[PDB]
């Protein structure tokens, strides 16, 4: 009874062409209608394959809009491009002027950093005296900042690096004066020895900028000694680097609860100028593995701080440097799992005899250190261009990210004449800046500032200061949100539309053909 169930479904079915086929009395008509039915089915299959695979492309969609939701005020990190304190630097210079032999100066100071610095430099003095004409490029690299940040305890450097009370003259946020002890957080950087992060504290002494953050910073180097001859002062310079010799402040504007990286991000402000940073907040939201790539955690990190793609990329570079050169770059984060790995610039291998002789062994050790540095730098420059290596580190963009488009601007802060007189008075008579250093531990700095910043030379002295203004220019955030382009619901709708357009079947008609198949089973 195949024919039986066949004609039954035929006469009562809701499907379109099959009926005419089943009830076609004319032979040529049966041929025509079978042809039409199968052609339509074939085209339906074509379009269904197309749409099904388009959905399987797990495509992506994006929208952009301005929204009134306010972002949290950004964290502002300020670094003085000069790493060491002015009094410390002048002390070093004057010690070397009194006696140029570092070995003799190890016991001429009670300051811990000075003793460590002289001890470290003494290991290289004979080599420098004997071979500087033959290998100047070597000694210029050995005597760089990063070497000292890699070989001296950061807790010892912090006593000689720029101090907060000697760096931030004044600070204001949201119409109130900052509490520097509670709002500024110190952190150590291999190049910018001491850096400070401002974390906003909303109002619970009313003065200052009402709609943002403003501070006056001591950033110039005018009070350093001006020698008659070029003299070598290790640990101040960084040979052949982009941020070398510069004077001013390095400013990084970044979301709160994120680690800054001043050596490869941020903005620069020269001394004597007032900088205005117009912050235009931006927010990006991203979708997960199937529809895209994003991460809410650092694959290399402990997960304590908010995720930024820079962290993953830098830790990946450190991974590859350690793998290739057998040492870690001091200018990159230390991998948490590998605290035992030595920095590439480490020099604990040097014998004590190198403080007294320029022997070949000391020279060979010097060149081996130079070669380690070369290895690390070569890998740093090469690896970013190696897409295989970078993809192996799984550094996907953050799933929820706040970005800041900053509009830069400069003006000359202390104006000539009466306006500048008022500025000078505000600093030195009301805030009484130079009396901060009237202590047992900073008497020399007090005398230096007293002689330097006196009234008669304010027009020149004041140009060592810089002012920063950071404010949110637009109250409305530019949001940019990803989304799935082709939902399961849209898939179902479009497959149904195609099904109706090509064969006329509906899901109830699907149950109908299922009934026919079950009827054939029962037969």
């Amino acid at each position: 009874a195949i024919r039986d169930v066949m004609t039954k479904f035929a006469e009562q079915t809701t499907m379109h062409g099959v009926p005419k086929v089943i009830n076609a009395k004319s032979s040529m008509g049966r041929l025509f209608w079978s042809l039409v039915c199968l052609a339509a089915g074939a085209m339906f299959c074509l379009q269904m394959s197309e749409v099904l695979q388009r959905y399987f492309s797990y495509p992506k969609k994006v929208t952009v809009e301005v929204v009134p939701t306010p972002v949290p005020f950004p964290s502002i990190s300020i670094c003085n491009m000069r790493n060491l304190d002015v009094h410390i630097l002048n002390t070093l210079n004057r010690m070397f002027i009194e006696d140029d032999r570092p070995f003799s100066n190890i016991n001429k100071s009670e300051h811990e950093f000075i003793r460590a610095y002289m001890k470290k430099v003494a290991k290289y003095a004979p080599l420098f005296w004997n071979y500087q004409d033959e290998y100047p490029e070597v000694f210029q690299e050995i005597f760089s900042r990063t070497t000292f940040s890699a070989n001296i305890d950061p807790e010892v450097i912090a006593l000689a690096a720029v101090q907060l009370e000697g760096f931030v003259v004044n600070c204001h946020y949201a119409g109130h004066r900052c509490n520097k002890t509670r709002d500024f957080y110190r952190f150590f950087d291999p190049y910018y020895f001491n850096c400070f992060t401002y974390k906003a504290h909303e109002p619970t002494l009313s003065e200052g900028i009402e709609n943002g953050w403003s501070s006056i910073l001591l950033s110039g180097s005018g009070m350093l000694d001006k020698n008659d001859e070029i003299r070598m002062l290790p640990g101040l310079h960084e040979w052949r680097s982009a941020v070398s010799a510069s004077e001013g402040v390095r400013v990084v504007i970044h979301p709160p609860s994120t680690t800054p990286y001043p050596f490869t991000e941020g903005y620069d402000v020269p001394p004597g100028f007032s900088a205005s940073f117009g912050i235009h907040p931006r927010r990006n939201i991203r979708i997960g593995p199937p529809h895209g790539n994003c991460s809410d955690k650092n694959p290399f990190g402990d997960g304590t701080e908010r995720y930024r793609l820079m962290a993953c990329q830098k830790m990946c570079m450190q991974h590859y440097i350690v793998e290739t050169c057998g040492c870690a770059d001091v200018g990159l984060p230390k991998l948490p799992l590998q605290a035992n790995i030595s920095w590439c610039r480490d020099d604990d291998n040097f014998p004590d005899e190198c403080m007294f002789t320029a022997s070949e062994e000391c020279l060979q050790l010097l060149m081996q250190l130079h070669n380690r540095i070369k290895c690390a730098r070569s890998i740093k420059s090469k690896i970013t261009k190696n897409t295989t290596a970078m993809e192996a580190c799984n550094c996907f963009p953050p799933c929820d990210e706040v970005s800041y488009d900053v509009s830069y601007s400069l003006s000359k802060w202390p104006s000539a004449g009466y306006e500048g007189d008022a500025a000078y008075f505000d600093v030195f008579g009301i805030e009484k800046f130079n009396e901060r250093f009237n202590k047992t531990g900073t008497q020399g700095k007090y005398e230096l500032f007293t002689k330097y910043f006196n009234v008669s030379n304010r027009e020149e002295s004041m140009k060592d200061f810089a002012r920063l203004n950071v404010y949110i220019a637009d109250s409305n955030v530019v949001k940019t949100q990803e989304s799935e382009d082709y939902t399961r619901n849209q898939l179902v709708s479009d497959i149904g539309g195609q099904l109706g357009l090509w064969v006329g079947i509906s899901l109830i008609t699907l149950a109908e053909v299922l009934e026919l198949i079950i009827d054939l089973f029962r037969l």
Binding site: F96, V121, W129, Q132, R231, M232
Partner: peptide, 4 residues
Amino acid sequence: FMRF
């Protein structure tokens, strides 16, 4: 000779 660059002295220190």
